[PDB]
């Protein structure tokens, strides 16, 4: 059962766009350090990544956004513009 479930999940992670990340309830935006709606917090994070050297999410893949999140923790300083 695990291998079938894993294949289905691989299909999901290959096909999933960034839309599935906006369809949600209140989330925590670290850009403003406050609770914000899903789409607004997502746009805040996207723009603060694009202001820095993190522009992989524009390919449409959620996995590319996860790669951006991964490489963000490797950068020494993250500047937030308001």
Q: Given the rule CB under 8 A, which residues bind another protein?
A: 2-7, 9-11, 13-15, 17-19, 22-23, 28, 37-40, 42-43, 58-61, 63-64, 66-67, 70-71, 73-74
**Distance separating alpha carbons of residues 55 and 34, to the nearest angstrom:** 24
For residues 60 and 33, is the Cβ–Cβ distance under 8 A?
A: no
For residues 52 and 75, is the Cβ–Cβ distance under 8 A?
A: yes
Q: How far is the CB of 68 from another protein (least distance, A)?
A: 12
Nearer to another protein (CB atom), residue 32 or residue 63: 63
Nearer to another protein (CB atom), residue 53 or residue 60: 60
Q: How far is the CB of 43 from another protein (least distance, A)?
A: 5
């Amino acid at each position: 059962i695990f291998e079938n479930s894993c294949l289905e999940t691989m299909e999901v992670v290959q096909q999933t766009r960034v839309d599935r990340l906006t369809q949600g309830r209140q989330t925590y935006d670290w850009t403003l350090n406050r609770n914000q709606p899903a789409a607004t917090a997502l746009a805040n994070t996207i723009e603060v990544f694009r202001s820095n050297g993190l522009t992989a999410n524009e390919s449409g893949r959620l996995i590319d956004f996860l790669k951006d999140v991964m490489e963000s923790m490797d950068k020494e300083e993250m500047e937030i513009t308001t």
